[PDB]
Amino acid sequence: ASXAM
Ligand SMILES: [Cu+2]
Ligand code: NA
Ligand code: NA
């Protein structure tokens, strides 16, 4: 939530 691939 605080970190997309
Ligand atoms: Cu993330
Ligand atoms: Na982190
Ligand atoms: Na990517």
Q: Give a list of the ligands.
A: copper (II) ion, sodium ion
Assign an overall shape.
elongated
What's the number of extended β-strand segments? 0
What fraction of the residues are assigned to beta strands by DSSP? under 5%
Main sheet overview: none
Q: In whole angstroms, how far apart are the ends? A: 13 Å
What is the share of helical residues?
Answer: under 10%
Counting helices, strands and paired strands, the structural category is little secondary structure
Radius of gyration from the CA trace? 6 Å
- Total count of helical runs of at least 4 residues: 0
Structure description:
- With 5 residues, this protein is largely without helices or strands.
- Helix content is 0%, strand content 0%.
- It contains no helices and no strands.
- The protein is elongated.
- The PDB classes it as metal transport.
- Keywords: metal transport, methanotrophs.
- The assembly is monomeric.
Task: Compose a concise summary of this entry.
With 5 residues, the protein is mostly loops. It binds copper (II) ion and sodium ion (2 copies).
Give me the secondary-structure topology.
Blueprint: no helix or strand
Bound molecules: copper (II) ion and sodium ion (NA) (2 copies).
Identify the notable features of this structure and list them briefly.
little secondary structure; 5 residues; binds sodium ion; binds copper (II) ion
